[PDB]
Ligand binder design. Structure first.
Ligand code: MGD
Ligand code: MGD
Ligand code: SF4
Ligand code: SF4
Ligand code: SF4
Ligand code: SF4
Ligand code: SF4
Ligand code: SF4
Ligand code: SF4
Ligand code: SF4
Ligand code: SF4
Ligand code: SF4
Ligand code: SF4
Ligand code: SF4
Ligand code: SF4
Ligand code: SF4
Ligand code: K
Ligand code: H2S
Ligand code: W
Lengths: 342, 126, 80, 429, 94
């Protein structure tokens, strides 16, 4: 017997027996593209409207699975390009089973080439990239010597006020007949000093010497780069944004985007829905200049179809001419994957 | 409690004045004082409780109501009407325009009743 | 069964939703331009008798634009 | 059920001219396109008093009379007054307003409309520094920064945003998505909820805030690190948004006409808009309240040379808001008679003014029961403009649209009542 | 600003916050992580840290006719009602 448990937004469908099968749906990863419901051979999945699940708050999940129809074949988990559906067999996910088809996609950063500029981290539309970097200590980006002649110094306090980095400290005091001085010491924190020479130039008694200048380690920037495979959607923004061509991406699907600008009424739904940041509303550069109403850059498109699905006036259509997978050994699966071409 | 009184339009007061100032609809929409939930707690009142509003220029009784349009701390809102115009500042500073908005007032709970439209106008001894 | 649902008792009849709707806009140049339709046209909803009134819900694509343009939760997409 | 399309709504200064009226048996029973307020005026609400016939009070109870007798009593009052006030005007059409001016000259009256409790401060401001405006269609087709300063259109001009912001225009074909929306209000209004930037400033500190914005605009550093509760950095960011507009519009309302500084809040708003035009095309529009408050100021200005608070006591027109305004004559106890037409000062003047209306004869041209009719000594019910009578009205940015007569009425129109009244006042002298 | 790749390291390391970058989220219509970079030369103290941290050598920075010499001005007041004539001022003066 097939059963179902709905924990929060998530859905689990289980069949026990000699072979255990569990289909797990994480609502937080679903982009509501609808592909699972199209490929389902028993029409067990019904997907909710893509716009409403993204722009409004809903109590229900993005999809609904009919336990009575689900046979736990896992075509849905095999096609999903957002890693939102997983079929586990005897505790093991089908992504680990070569007999099961797997879409072909990747995203890598060459750490040797990467200079830790953080552009990809900023541009990633799924916040799947983490870039850490260690800058040198400030004191290593300046070289110079500085000394204050504490005898010549009259403790006027002008250097202390004018230091742009508060590197000079004076030990002020109220005089007494036993200590007839307005200060007892002056110091330069050479960890803070950036050797701008302002102090020397303001000093009224020329008490400050300041000048800018063997194997010292050269100061250099270090860092790391991580791509979360569960969040990574393979749009290739990282590959394009990178200034040193350090990021490489490959996509599962090939296809075409077609927009009817005159049908589009610029409600922005598809723009908000697109998990790859393909679609946008350009701003005119000059008063009286007109722009393309709905702009696209297919360099970032993965041809999932969420935008086309979300558009209430059908202004966008998504052609899909190829789905790259590992070997599809079942001819019945092969035809079901081919049913998604258009 | 000393609060700042702001006054002006609401869609419900607009519907009420074009139906009839004589209807109960108008009292329910303009003889009210909108307050933030937290101010009602500190004063010990709930929605529906009546409030005595005293200023330097007069006094009035209005029904307290939670503000669906949140107010800044220390501010209350009474919709435009004869109840609001019991307490706001009349002087025009030689512009002809009275100070209808942002007036220091005292607010306290009261078991007293809200006057309806014909009765409230009686205070002016016509 | 998510679909459009009005709350006319919360509605100002302000018209934001009617204008923002891409379906309404596509079908009526007047709506597209912020006007209430004067020409007889079949759209999803209008303001009638001072409140939003769903007329042809079969045309709704449940995109949520109208919902996000209303500040008083007088129109929503939910289970029916 | 005849359908009347292209009706002009007689409520607010948005002056929507796309209303559709449902007419069932010489009665308006429903509307299309009208907002919840507009619908309310077009349709009678059950139980509400609509005055069928003239009234005169004798012992605190009114008595029905004819138009001629009530107009005769009214003309008697005005003709023997030495400082009569003729107030209201904003909810009637322009021909009635024009008879009112000729009557005000004949009677030696002060004629004033609702501007003196509304955008009169804006009128005083624009007389000192100017008036850079545009019409609605320009906002619709060009504007990419829209600012609602001290107004709450969702509650007071309900279709204003849909008609000007969500609307798609020629150079703004994406509607709402092509415009940066700014609301300035101490409250989290339902208008501010729709904004991209909400300046939730301290009340009564707009003038201070605009001083910082203007000074930042002209390249000066802002003295204080927070102005009107708005951080210095946020003020500079706001000014940059205005400077980068291709076409900006500043809508504004009672939040700055009624609050501390009054006309000087508008003054400084206007001068910022003017000076913005060295960086970006900028204009403003005052959110005129009643559907034809703008019309009275137009008529009065072109006939007498002055817009409101006009005193004809000396024959020559003279003008001094602060002296010759409605609330000034009442609060200083100058007026000895008040004629109210198409307005409700009983509900909407302060108590100090109401104290004077109780001491003097009060005449009310009013179709409904209001606090004013409670303070009244004569009541004269008219035909309602835009439903039962026609005539010109002026939208908030000066566009003249002719109100339409949708149904018939046995009642006299404002214009008729005033014309007979004028004739009788001439007589009584 | 062409060589600059907007890594933001100069902006972080400037000891006086003289460099500002106009960061943004990219869009297909504006595929860049920033739109501008500026140096407030009123704040800059010409320490050259930015130039030395830049990974693409986008920053030129070098330390260098009647310009008024900068000099300190001031005033001095002795309140005769408070002055007690102890001479601490005479002795402490350098
Ligand atoms: N429902 C309804 N609609 C109407 C009318 C009505 O009676 N009812 N009458 C019509 C008329 S006559 C007019 S004039 C218009 C007026 O329309 P609005 O100009 O919107 O008038 P108000 O709602 O009184 O005030 C608007 C806002 O000013 C804000 N405010 C108060 N103090 C300050 C301040 O110090 N600074 C700032 N920035 N804002 C402040 C308030 O929070 C309020 O939300 O409405 C018209 N429409
Ligand atoms: N506390 C406070 N007080 C305020 C304000 C505020 O914000 N706060 N705002 C002030 C402002 S801005 C204004 S303008 C006033 C509101 O100004 P009012 O003019 O007092 O507003 P209404 O109550 O709409 O008054 C219009 C009256 O005219 C009647 N009428 C409608 N159509 C016609 C017609 O065709 N002919 C005639 N003869 N009569 C007609 C209506 O039934 C109604 O009673 O309130 C002011 N008072
Ligand atoms: S397929 Fe598209 S829709 Fe079906 S799950 Fe993966 S994401 Fe959600
Ligand atoms: S498992 Fe095979 S069946 Fe159950 S849903 Fe996913 S697809 Fe339709
Ligand atoms: S963009 Fe290229 S370089 Fe900059 S961080 Fe991402 S990867 Fe490293
Ligand atoms: S050099 Fe520049 S920084 Fe180093 S101390 Fe003198 S002043 Fe401060
Ligand atoms: S400036 Fe020259 S003298 Fe004055 S304190 Fe610094 S050092 Fe001593
Ligand atoms: S590919 Fe698209 S998603 Fe995957 S990282 Fe590079 S960017 Fe983020
Ligand atoms: S395409 Fe359809 S969805 Fe994307 S904007 Fe135009 S209308 Fe809204
Ligand atoms: S645009 Fe390309 S990626 Fe973005 S939604 Fe449509 S298809 Fe999926
Ligand atoms: S629904 Fe929200 S938006 Fe559509 S009309 Fe009623 S209020 Fe205006
Ligand atoms: S949901 Fe999208 S479509 Fe359905 S109405 Fe609101 S807007 Fe028009
Ligand atoms: S906006 Fe003012 S004018 Fe247009 S309908 Fe609503 S009320 Fe009548
Ligand atoms: S030089 Fe020193 S100070 Fe001037 S900008 Fe570069 S870093 Fe900041
Ligand atoms: S460091 Fe060199 S590159 Fe990085 S931002 Fe400053 S300048 Fe642009
Ligand atoms: S110091 Fe002694 S002397 Fe010099 S001032 Fe102060 S008191 Fe007069
Ligand atoms: K009515
Ligand atoms: S007004
Ligand atoms: W007004």
């Amino acid at each position: 017997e097939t059963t179902e448990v709905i924990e929060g937004k998530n859905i689990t469908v289980e069949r026990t027996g000699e072979e255990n099968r569990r289909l797990i749906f994480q609502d937080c990863l679903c982009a509501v593209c609808g592909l699972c419901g199209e490929i389902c051979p028993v029409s067990a999945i019904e997907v909710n409207p893509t716009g409403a699940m993204v722009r409004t708050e809903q109590e229900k999940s993005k999809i609904a699975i009919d336990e009575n129809k689900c046979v736990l074949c896992g075509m849905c988990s095999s096609i999903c390009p957002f890693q939102a559906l997983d079929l586990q067999i005897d505790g093991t996910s089908i992504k680990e089973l070569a007999e099961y088809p797997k879409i072909i996609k990747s995203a890598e950063i060459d750490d040797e080439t990467c200079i830790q500029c953080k552009a990809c981290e900023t541009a990633c539309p799924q916040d799947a990239i983490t870039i850490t970097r260690e800058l040198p200590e400030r004191k290593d980006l300046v070289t110079g010597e500085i000394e204050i002649d504490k005898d010549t110094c009259i403790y006027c306090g002008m250097c202390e006020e004018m230091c742009p980095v508060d590197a000079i400290e004076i030990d002020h005091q109220t005089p007494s007949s036993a200590s007839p001085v307005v200060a007892t010491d002056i110091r330069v924190d050479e960890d803070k000093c950036v050797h701008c020479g302002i102090c020397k130039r303001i000093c009224p008694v020329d008490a400050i010497m300041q000048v800018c200048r063997y194997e010292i380690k050269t100061p250099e920037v270090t860092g790391t780069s991580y791509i979360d495979p569960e969040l990574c959607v393979n749009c290739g923004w990282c590959q394009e944004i990178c200034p040193v061509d350090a990021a490489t991406v490959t996509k599962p699907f090939e296809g075409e985007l077609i927009i009817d600008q005159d049908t589009c009424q610029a409600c922005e739904t598809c723009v908000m829905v697109c998990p790859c940041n393909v679609l946008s509303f350009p701003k005119p550069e000059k008063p009286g200049e007109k722009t393309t109403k709905l702009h696209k850059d297919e360099r970032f498109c993965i041809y999932c179809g969420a935008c086309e699905r979300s558009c209430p006036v059908t202004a966008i259509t998504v052609k899909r001419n190829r789905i790259n997978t590992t070997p599809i050994r079942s001819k019945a699966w092969k035809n079901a994957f081919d049913s998604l071409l258009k | 409690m000393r609060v700042i009184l702001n006054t002006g339009r609401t869609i419900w007061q607009g519907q009420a004045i074009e139906s009839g100032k004589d209807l109960k609809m108008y009292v329910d929409a303009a003889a009210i004082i909108q307050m933030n939930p937290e101010m009602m707690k500190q004063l010990g009142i709930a929605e529906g409780d009546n409030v005595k509003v005293i200023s330097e220029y007069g006094d009035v009784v209005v029904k307290a109501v939670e503000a669906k349009e949140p107010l800044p701390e220390g501010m209350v809102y009474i919709p435009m009407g004869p109840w609001a115009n019991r307490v706001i500042r009349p002087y025009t500073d030689s512009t002809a325009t009275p100070s209808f908005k942002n007036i220091p007032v005292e607010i306290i709970p009261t078991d007293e009743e809200v006057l309806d439209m014909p009765t409230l106008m009686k205070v002016y001894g016509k | 069964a998510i679909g459009l649902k009005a709350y006319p008792e919360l509605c100002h009849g302000c018209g934001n939703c009617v204008i923002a709707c891409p379906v309404n806009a596509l079908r009526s140049p007047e709506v597209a331009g912020g006007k209430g339709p004067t020409d007889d046209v079949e759209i999803i909803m209008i303001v009638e008798d001072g409140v939003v009134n769903i007329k042809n819900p079969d045309l709704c694509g449940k995109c949520g634009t109208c919902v996000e343009s209303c500040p008083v939760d007088a129109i929503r997409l939910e289970e029916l | 059920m005849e359908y009347v399309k292209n009706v002009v709504c007689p409520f607010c200064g948005t002056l929507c001219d796309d209303i559709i009226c449902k007419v069932e048996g010489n009665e308006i029973v429903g509307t299309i396109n009208a907002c919840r307020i507009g619908h309310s005026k077009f349709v009678h609400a059950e139980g509400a008093m609509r005055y069928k016939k003239p009234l005169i009070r004798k012992n605190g109870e009114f008595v029905e009379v004819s138009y001629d007798e009530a107009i005769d009593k009214a003309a008697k009052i005005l003709a023997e007054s030495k400082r009569p006030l003729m107030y209201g005007w904003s909810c009637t059409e322009c021909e009635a307003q024009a008879v009112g001016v000729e009557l005000a000259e004949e009677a030696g009256a002060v004629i004033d409309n609702t501007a003196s409790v509304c955008h009169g401060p804006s009128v005083l401001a624009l007389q000192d520094v100017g008036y850079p405006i545009c019409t609605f269609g320009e906002v619709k087709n060009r504007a990419d920064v829209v600012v609602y300063w001290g107004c709450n259109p969702m509650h007071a001009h309900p279709r204003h945003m849909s008609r000007n912001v969500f609307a798609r225009g020629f150079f703004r074909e994406r509607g709402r998505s092509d415009r940066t929306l700014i609301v300035v209000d101490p409250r989290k209004t339902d208008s501010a909820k729709l904004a991209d930037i909400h300046l939730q400033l301290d009340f009564d500190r707009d003038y201070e805030l605009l001083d910082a914005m203007r000074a930042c605009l002209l390249g000066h550093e802002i003295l204080y690190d927070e102005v009107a509760g708005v951080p210095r950095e946020q003020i500079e960011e706001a000014v940059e948004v205005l400077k980068n507009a291709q076409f900006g519009i500043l809508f504004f309302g009672m939040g700055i006409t009624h609050s501390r500084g009054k006309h000087r809040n508008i003054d400084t708003a206007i001068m910022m808009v003017q000076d913005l035009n060295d960086y970006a095309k900028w204009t403003l529009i005052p959110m005129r309240g009643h559907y034809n408050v703008t019309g009275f100021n137009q008529v009065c200005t072109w006939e007498s040379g002055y817009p409101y608070c006009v005193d004809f006591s000396g024959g020559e027109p003279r003008y001094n808001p602060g002296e010759t305004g409605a609330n000034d004559l009442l609060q200083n106890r100058e007026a000895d008679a008040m004629m109210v037409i198409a307005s409700d000062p009983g509900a909407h003047f302060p108590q100090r003014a109401l104290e004077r209306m109780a001491e003097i004869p009060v005449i009310a041209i009013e179709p409904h029961r209001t606090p004013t009719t409670e303070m009244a000594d004569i009541i004269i019910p008219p035909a309602i403009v835009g439903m039962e009578a026609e005539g010109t009205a002026y939208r908030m940015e000066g566009v003249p649209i002719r109100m339409k007569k949708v149904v018939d009425s046995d009642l006299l129109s404002d214009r008729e009542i005033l014309e007979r009244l004028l004739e009788k006042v001439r007589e009584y002298k």
